[PDB]
Amino acid sequence: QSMSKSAVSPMMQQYLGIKAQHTDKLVFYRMGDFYELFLDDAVEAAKLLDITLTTRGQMDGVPIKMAGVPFHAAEQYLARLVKLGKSVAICEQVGEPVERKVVRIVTPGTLTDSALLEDKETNRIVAVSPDKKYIGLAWASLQSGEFKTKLTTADKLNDELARLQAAEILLPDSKNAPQLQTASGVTRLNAWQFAADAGEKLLTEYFGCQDLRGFGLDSKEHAVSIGAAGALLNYIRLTQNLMPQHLDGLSLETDSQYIGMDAATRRNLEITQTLSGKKTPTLFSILDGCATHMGSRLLALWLHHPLRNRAHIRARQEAVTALESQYEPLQCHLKSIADIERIAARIAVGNARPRDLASLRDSLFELAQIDLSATGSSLLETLKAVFPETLPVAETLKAAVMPEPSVWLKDGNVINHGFHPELDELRRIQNHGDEFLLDLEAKERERTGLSTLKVEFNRVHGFYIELSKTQAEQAPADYQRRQTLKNAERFITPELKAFEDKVLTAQDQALALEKQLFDGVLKNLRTALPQLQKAAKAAAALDVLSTFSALAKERNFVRPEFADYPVVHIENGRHPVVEQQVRHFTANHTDLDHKHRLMLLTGPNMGGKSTYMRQVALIVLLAHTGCFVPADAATIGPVDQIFTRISTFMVEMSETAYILHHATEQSIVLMDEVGRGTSTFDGLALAHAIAEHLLQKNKSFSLFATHYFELTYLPEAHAAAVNMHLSALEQGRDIVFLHQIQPGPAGKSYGIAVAKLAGLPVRALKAAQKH
Amino acid sequence: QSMSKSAVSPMMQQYLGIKAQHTDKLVFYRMGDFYELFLDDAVEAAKLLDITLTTRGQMDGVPIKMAGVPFHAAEQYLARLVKLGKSVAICEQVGEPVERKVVRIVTPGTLTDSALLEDKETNRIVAVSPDKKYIGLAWASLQSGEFKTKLTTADKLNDELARLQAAEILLPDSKNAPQLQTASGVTRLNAWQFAADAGEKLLTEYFGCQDLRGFGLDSKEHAVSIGAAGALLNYIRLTQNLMPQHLDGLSLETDSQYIGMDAATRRNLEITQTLSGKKTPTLFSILDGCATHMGSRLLALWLHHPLRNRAHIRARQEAVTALESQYEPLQCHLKSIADIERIAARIAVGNARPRDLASLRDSLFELAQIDLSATGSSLLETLKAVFPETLPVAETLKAAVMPEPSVWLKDGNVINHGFHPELDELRRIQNHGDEFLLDLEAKERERTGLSTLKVEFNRVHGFYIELSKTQAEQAPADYQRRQTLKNAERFITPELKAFEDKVLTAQDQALALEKQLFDGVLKNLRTALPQLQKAAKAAAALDVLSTFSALAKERNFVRPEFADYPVVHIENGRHPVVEQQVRHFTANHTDLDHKHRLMLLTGPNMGGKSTYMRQVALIVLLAHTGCFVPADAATIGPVDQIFTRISTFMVEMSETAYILHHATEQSIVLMDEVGRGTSTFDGLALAHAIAEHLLQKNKSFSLFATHYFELTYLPEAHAAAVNMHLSALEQGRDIVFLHQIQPGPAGKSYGIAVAKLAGLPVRALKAAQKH
Numbered sequence A, B: 001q002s003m004s005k006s007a008v009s010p011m012m013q014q015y016l017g018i019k020a021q022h023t024d025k026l027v028f029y030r031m032g033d034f035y036e037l038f039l040d041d042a043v044e045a046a047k048l049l050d051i052t053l054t055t056r057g058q059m060d061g062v063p064i065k066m067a068g069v070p071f072h073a074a075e076q077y078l079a080r081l082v083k084l085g086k087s088v089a090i091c092e093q094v095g096e097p098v099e100r101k102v103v104r105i106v107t108p109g110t111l112t113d114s115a116l117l118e119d120k121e122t123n124r125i126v127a128v129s130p131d132k133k134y135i136g137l138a139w140a141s142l143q144s145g146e147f148k149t150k151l152t153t154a155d156k157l158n159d160e161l162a163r164l165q166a167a168e169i170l171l172p173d174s175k176n177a178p179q180l181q182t183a184s185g186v187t188r189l190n191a192w193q194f195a196a197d198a199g200e201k202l203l204t205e206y207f208g209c210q211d212l213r214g215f216g217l218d219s220k221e222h223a224v225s226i227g228a229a230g231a232l233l234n235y236i237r238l239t240q241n242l243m244p245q246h247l248d249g250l251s252l253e254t255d256s257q258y259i260g261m262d263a264a265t266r267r268n269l270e271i272t273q274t275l276s277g278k279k280t281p282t283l284f285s286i287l288d289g290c291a292t293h294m295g296s297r298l299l300a301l302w303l304h305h306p307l308r309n310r311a312h313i314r315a316r317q318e319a320v321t322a323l324e325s326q327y328e329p330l331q332c333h334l335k336s337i338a339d340i341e342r343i344a345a346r347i348a349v350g351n352a353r354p355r356d357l358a359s360l361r362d363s364l365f366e367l368a369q370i371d372l373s374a375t376g377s378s379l380l381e382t383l384k385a386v387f388p389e390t391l392p393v394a395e396t397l398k399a400a401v402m403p404e405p406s407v408w409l410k411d412g413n414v415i416n417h418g419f420h421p422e423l424d425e426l427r428r429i430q431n432h433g434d435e436f437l438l439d440l441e442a443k444e445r446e447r448t449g450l451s452t453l454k455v456e457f458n459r460v461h462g463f464y465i466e467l468s469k470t471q472a473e474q475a476p477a478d479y480q481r482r483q484t485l486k487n488a489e490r491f492i493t494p495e496l497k498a499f500e501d502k503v504l505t506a507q508d509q510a511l512a513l514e515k516q517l518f519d520g521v522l523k524n525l526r527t528a529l530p531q532l533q534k535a536a537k538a539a540a541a542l543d544v545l546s547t548f549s550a551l552a553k554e555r556n557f558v559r560p561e562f563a564d565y566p567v568v569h570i571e572n573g574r575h576p577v578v579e580q581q582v583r584h585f586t587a588n589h590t591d592l593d594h595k596h597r598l599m600l601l602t603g604p605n606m607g608g609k610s611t612y613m614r615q616v617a618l619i620v621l622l623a624h625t626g627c628f629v630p631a632d633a634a635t636i637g638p639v640d641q642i643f644t645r646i647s648t649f650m651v652e653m654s655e656t657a658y659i660l661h662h663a664t665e666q667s668i669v670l671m672d673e674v675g676r677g678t679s680t681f682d683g684l685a686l687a688h689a690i691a692e693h694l695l696q697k698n699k700s701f702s703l704f705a706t707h708y709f710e711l712t713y714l715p716e717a718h719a720a721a722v723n724m725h726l727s728a729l730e731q732g733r734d735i736v737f738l739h740q741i742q743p744g745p746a747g748k749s750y751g752i753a754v755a756k757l758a759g760l761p762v763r764a765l766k767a768a769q770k771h
């Protein structure tokens, strides 16, 4: 393996220096006004981006493959590449003098740029450190500050992964990495980065605390999850420009905090995504009346993390009732603030640009005006306390940044007038720009008798005066001259050289001064990042609570009550999504307690069994978010998990296996027509057993819909079973469904579909009666 | 109700004269370089087309509402309008001297323009004349010449409508018009147009024959269908520019010609349309390797009309075998011909434009070159005899029309050179155009000393010579002058007036001459329409048979045999659509006779039950189209109908009613999991009865898939019953489906999905055993 380095250009040789460090990722090498890619990176990017592949120069004889993109559209192409789980290192040149650096690595899970994120996109990076009994989970969202760790098991893993919706996963390079789907981008990390002891040094040093007990860890059992946090914190460090200091606390997630739901249950209920994978009526889209982007994202969070702690739930409920009389002024203020949660993020990772501070400034002022707007008597009063706390940050931004700064700091006109006296003075040499030149042209027109001379400028030559070749002979030896032209001839003069060296120096010192003063206020903002993140969280909380208020007031939701005994009482409740799809939707009751635990639904095929079942689960879910539920009243007992089951057939049996040995007395199980598949022999036998389990060996409140009429006999075999069914009425030779729960099991009226039949249908009426 | 007529403009008064005759249709009133619509038409069209609604002028004091479209995109909006089932009258002005006329009425069922039709779109207009016991059906396709009538019943109506895929329906305005869907565009026709006696005069005069016995009618029972044909013939006349003379014969369709399939069966088998209504793998898309558009349309026709006559089937089968050795040269010729079936149609209706004759000419020549290409021994030899028959038409077209004519006849350069001697001479005055003017400019440059004069032309002044106002004083009195300008001044002269009156007269006489000669050869073509229609039918037939030859050679299809006894033998057959979706598809046998009639499929879910069933029905269907079936060998007995049954539940019971009292010994019935709905009591009772009918009270060859294991006992109760099932094998903790038919009823192995369960599954294994 001998080399050139005469076989390869020094521009290319430098590229290979960078590319060697990022052999797994695409490298956007800045080349002029383009980012270019070389070699296999070129062939890859030319496939992926439908941009033209080409060739530049030679390397060891061989033409070098190349492909590029204009700088003005780089974020756009970057957005595509990360949609396809690709990382890109951005190689720019940096210095005073110049070195080729990587500056920033864009990965699917560390996005903070508004250009690479949808407005309601939650963006998480999760790292799994597997012991083998336990598994350390640690996740973070650079855009929201979130930073949590959890201890979990191997089989309970894909549930946690679906819950977190991670955009990127960090795995060890070890041979005992957990087998898993792929998924989002999966990024493997060289083993020792998940070290618990090194992960503990990193964490304690990042938060500047003694140990990790306050967060509820210590390297006893949690060691594996401490290392996973460590690995996350390192990967953030390797990818981000500045190491962000906005990662809020670091909480241990226990299973007791939220109503657990398996992956399939999240999917089936269509919480944030349909069964065909969209935003075509979901629970989130039907409730998403948030005024802010950060509010919308928070609501997505809440709908997936229904609280178990009934105190926090009431804290939230006290707020929403209080906001009932004052949400229309609130939602006007919030509607005009920008995404300050993301702006705080971009500040933290050294990625914020001049107009972000303008938006942050103006919205923090708009948040300070909510101090009136509303008051109350709850958690709200701690929310209100936050907004004026942040005015000191707004004032300093008002004083340091223009009302409208230029887009790029490099262009100047970012720092405000009067913030720095020197800058104003430096900047003042500008009228002396144009007025000294008008005072000079006129003092040369009469001096030469030519109204065909003006003081011109170009980047290469600087200031000059040009005269035609005819008039070039008319010029004094006071003029200095340089380059020769075709029609004309341009001249320097020492009395504008003195001017040129004054204004161009003033330009450079001003540009340099704005840079240093901007970096100065970023130094300040980054230290004031705690108050900023509190501002973001308070603004978004209030936005969701405001939305909860408006929904209840505008669609008749009621504050559900909580009980200490196993119970689910719902006074004519409704399905919150299907309710805005039907013009008329018929409400229905739901009564269950200790003695009435399993409701066995039987019914025709367009009788609303599924809808009614999903309606119950959705009311229970909503109940524990602090939102009000769609009913006239509701009362729910302590609930721990929600299970559902609504292609086949081992996936039917897989999802029910999980249900059977995880559901408890506090769980709520939903089962829709289990048995479809195989037969009516083995199918009925299984559906018989599964019911013979929810009643006995895990006393769960269950809704069990089924076509197996043979299961009607359960209320006459267990105290807890109940038979209910759904209505079908005769109108005019044509059947209809009023969609109403009715006690009992619907009788047999398929032979009633003689409303258009032909027989010899007695032969049917002779097989049933079947006693 | 007094009027203006001073309250309305004469340009609007003339519109109301036209609009009054077409009160039900939209009227495109040509207004300059636009077609505009007024009053309620405007409001209608503004909504439908997303075009801006506005105002022009006043009528009785009120601003007249208006909306319009440009001429250059008129066919595009018309296309939209007939997609939404609307009719449009095109009001142009005609004359020598100008009258407002309607010229053409575009209706959804009389389309012939390539610009209003999809390439493979079949376009039929059907007229129903209801007695009440009988119903006269009559339909026609202007694009294909098809013109048929049929006698039918009131309930058998929606089956026929769906079979004919009518783009438009003609109903009597009577109060006893049949209740029906709507559908396509339904067009009501003023009662007496469906008159049988008046219908018979129309029909006999159209074909110029004594009565209708040769077609198999006479006003005995066929009176109601004769009038239907009359109404159709009239609507064609009211709507078409020229009354077309290409309508082929007039056959009476009887129910015994084709294998009947109800509306649901045509949908379920996905013959030319999916269950979600697309071209996502259908039986037609999977076979459609036709080189021509007209070939494709014909394929659609045969897929919906499987022949009962086994002689015509063998005729087609003899042609496809003989083409096995000669289809690659055939499909290269056919690939380069145009849509001559439609072109013949546009000629018939006086709608043909110059380039259509060009395309027809070239393709009729290309069709003549198939006289070698292939020969054979069958029906083929009559096909070969047709192509050279049509050369006389190609010759005349070659001599009369340019190799490339202008787009519009009004622009000239359509009639070929040397076809008419006078036209060439009239046309020849054109070099005398440019050369006489070069011989005149030069004779005016030196005569005035000005190289700043050139002979010009504009549409207002004719020919002229212009000179600047400085040089207008330099012009002779030999110049005549007219309009004054700004910089210049233009002059007429009697020696270019003589020239102006020579070349413009020659232009008009030539444009007029081309018009009369073009109409002259259209007169010839329209009388040579019978040869043309035969050319189109012979080209298309061969294209479909060639395709059948390529499919059999390239996907291992075999020529099915026919039997005279009830039988369906299929040596490992395959599903022709699913077979190109799976990389590997496992073939399966099918054996049924007089003693083995009902195959009772039981099986797991993803066991290929449905697919195998639909495979049998599709093979039987394909067998009767002449095409070879996807198998190693196949033998089918006499078949009359194919019924299928694969949301709920009265529509389950409606479709099965139909099946139960229409299926015969010769029918082939397919039933997929009948019973799903209601329960397992009344569901099993109904599935019990329905099987207790196919065996006994209509000895039909039936495939009955069900999950009811209770129906396994049938082969031990009836001779004709058979139990088959579909395989499921264990590989590695993971079940798989080899998809193979196996005698017997699959046993009970859903408890076998303990491959991931958790119990207390003995309680299942305790309910089955169920003896």
Ligand SMILES: Nc1ncnc2c1ncn2[C@@H]1O[C@H](COP(=O)(O)OP(=O)(O)NP(=O)(O)O)[C@@H](O)[C@H]1O
Pocket (backbone or CB within 6 Å): A578, A582, A584, A585, A586, A587, A604, A605, A606, A607, A608, A609, A610, A611, A612, A672, A673, A705, A739
């Ligand atoms: N209360 C209601 N008001 C109005 N429409 C309803 C109501 N409940 C159900 N529907 C509609 O009824 C249809 C059938 O509801 P669904 O609950 O799917 O019946 P089902 O037979 O019980 N389905 P499955 O759960 O698979 O058995 C749906 O398309 C709903 O839109």
Ligand SMILES: Nc1ncnc2c1ncn2[C@@H]1O[C@H](COP(=O)(O)OP(=O)(O)NP(=O)(O)O)[C@@H](O)[C@H]1O
Pocket (backbone or CB within 6 Å): B578, B582, B584, B585, B586, B587, B588, B604, B605, B606, B607, B608, B609, B610, B611, B612, B646, B672, B673, B705, B738, B739, B740
């Ligand atoms: N003969 C075959 N050979 C190989 N694979 C097959 C065969 N038949 C079906 N499959 C596969 O089986 C899949 C679906 O089977 P399908 O016939 O729908 O199961 P089913 O439950 O028996 N249908 P249904 O009666 O409508 O419930 C298809 O995607 C095929 O790829």
